[PDB]
Ligand binder design. Structure first.
Ligand SMILES: [Cl-]
Ligand SMILES: [Cl-]
Ligand SMILES: [Cl-]
Ligand SMILES: [Cl-]
Ligand SMILES: [Cl-]
Ligand code: NA
Length: 129
């Protein structure tokens, strides 16, 4: 599913991501925009052989099982394919574990390079929330 900007903001908010670990909603929407262009089916293969999955491009090296990343962990305890669902619940739950782990949203390269330090509230401007 390719979400609209406000549609995704409202889904994220209902799932408890607004101000989660201090990160306002615009941060999450910005990260999703640049990681996946709001497409829950996005996949990208990394050089080490791991793959990134879903709207927030969660990586198989640590967070989900895809059966082809030898030596990896599955800290969210899910198949990576669950992260490609049109229902973003699995992706949100796993992201909450990721952002709690100490590095905050710096775990998302696109957030660090394209969202951090910018006016992220712009990503939710105009939305009914
Ligand atoms: Cl915001
Ligand atoms: Cl772009
Ligand atoms: Cl594996
Ligand atoms: Cl933090
Ligand atoms: Cl940018
Ligand atoms: Na894994």
């Amino acid at each position: 599913k390719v979400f609209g900007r406000c549609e995704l903001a409202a889904a994220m908010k209902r799932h408890g991501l607004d101000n989660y670990r201090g990160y306002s909603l615009g941060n999450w929407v910005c990260a999703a925009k640049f990681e996946s262009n709001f497409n829950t089916q996005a996949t990208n293969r990394n050089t080490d052989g791991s793959t990134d999955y879903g709207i927030l491009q969660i990586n198989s090296r640590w967070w989900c099982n895809d059966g082809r990343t030898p030596g990896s962990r599955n800290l969210c305890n899910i198949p990576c394919s669950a992260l490609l669902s049109s229902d973003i619940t699995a992706s949100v739950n796993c992201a909450k574990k990721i952002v709690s782990d100490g590095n905050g949203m710096n775990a998302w390269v696109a957030w660090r390079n394209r969202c951090k330090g910018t006016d992220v509230q712009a990503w939710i401007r105009g939305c009914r929330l």
